[PDB]
Amino acid sequence: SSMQRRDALNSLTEYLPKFKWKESKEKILDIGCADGSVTNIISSCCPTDFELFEACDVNVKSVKYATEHYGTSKMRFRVMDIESDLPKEMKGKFDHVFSFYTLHWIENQEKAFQNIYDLTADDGECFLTLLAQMPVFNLFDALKHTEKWRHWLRYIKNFISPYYETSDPDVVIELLLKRVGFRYVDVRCRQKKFEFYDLKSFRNLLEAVSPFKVGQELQEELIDDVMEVAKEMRIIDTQNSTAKLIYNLVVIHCRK
């Protein structure tokens, strides 16, 4: 989505000058590559010629789309769960580990952050972004106790950020990262705005980010009901036919 690309670019632009490379032949990893369009931004923006850049994701079709489109001899897309046990091959392998708009998908929060630590090299650093409060969560959440969608949206909480209703998520995450072993930790809760100027660009977003598989017959009907709720919640201005999303993106910069 456009929202995810801007936040990726804005993040890298700011924190790029705070990273240390300190050598030649740098191995890099991105967690939750999806289509690989953001990974391309990370790979491209990074000044160095990385000997190897890996990018993982649990979604099989996404990895295939990515390997088919962005795959090179040094840009390898593999399947992997970051909640699962790491292979010994990757323990302490990566000079930089990246992960944007992914860690809010993940139940086993403590294993993920420990795996990210374990993945990072002795003198390595990590750069992670993830969603806290996001109105889109609330838009779908308002549909989970309705006859129409009650059963499709049963595993809703498995997709909503564990931090969307949390007090001082920055403090909770920072403590988690320090207890994991990271010698340097910096976690910020960044309030963001993203405006949509027509309703179609807002409907395009809701379609892209919908984790549900309601089919084709019901698929259009779901988004319509989400758009109606979005009018009631004032996330889309009915007078102007515009949409406004105000959300928190927690951005993390650690060093082993």
Ligand X SMILES: Nc1ncnc2c1ncn2[C@@H]1O[C@H](CSCC[C@H](N)C(=O)O)[C@@H](O)[C@H]1O
Q: Which residues sit at the interface with ligand J10, rule CB under 6 A?
A: 1, 3-4, 101, 104-105, 131, 134, 136-137, 140, 159-160, 209-211
Q: How many other C-beta atoms can be found within 10 angstroms of the C-beta atom of residue 103?
A: 24
SS3 of residue 54 by DSSP: strand
Contact between 8 and ligand X per CB under 6 A: yes
The residue whose two tokens read 């990246």 is 98
Size of the site for its own copies (CB under 8 A): 29
Select the binding partner of residue 104 from ligand X, its own copies, ligand J10, none (C-beta < 5 to 8 A, by kind): ligand J10
Question: Between helices 219-232 and 199-209, what is the axis angle to 10°?
Answer: 120
Q: Which residues lie closer than 8 Å to 214 by C-beta, 6 or more apart?
A: 149, 152, 221, 222
The answer to whether the beta carbons of residues 52 and 27 sit under 8 Å apart is yes
Q: Which range touches its own copies (CB under 8 A), out of 70-78, 81-89, 208-216, 242-250?
A: 242-250
Kind plus residue range of the DSSP H or E element containing 183: none
Q: Give me the least distance between CB of 105 and ligand J10, in Å please.
A: 5
Q: Give me the least distance between CB of 139 and ligand J10, in Å please.
A: 6
Q: Give me the least distance between CB of 173 and its own copies, in Å please.
A: 11
Q: Give me the least distance between CB of 238 and ligand X, in Å please.
A: 29
Contact between 100 and ligand X per CB under 6 A: yes
For ligand X, give the closer residue by CB, 84 or 241: 84
Select the binding partner of residue 137 from ligand J10, its own copies, ligand X, none (C-beta < 5 to 8 A, by kind): ligand J10
**Positions in 42-81 near ligand X (CB under 6 A):** 56-59, 62, 81
Query: 242 to each of 26, 92, 235, 248, how far by Cα in Å?
Result: 44, 47, 9, 20
Size of the site for ligand X (CB under 6 A): 20
Return the beta strands (E) in 132-229 as ranges.
184-196
Query: 12 to each of 15, 229, 253, how far by Cα in Å?
Result: 5, 34, 11
Residues that bind its own copies (CB under 8 A): 132-133, 138, 141-142, 145, 163-171, 188-193, 229, 232-234, 239, 244, 246, 248
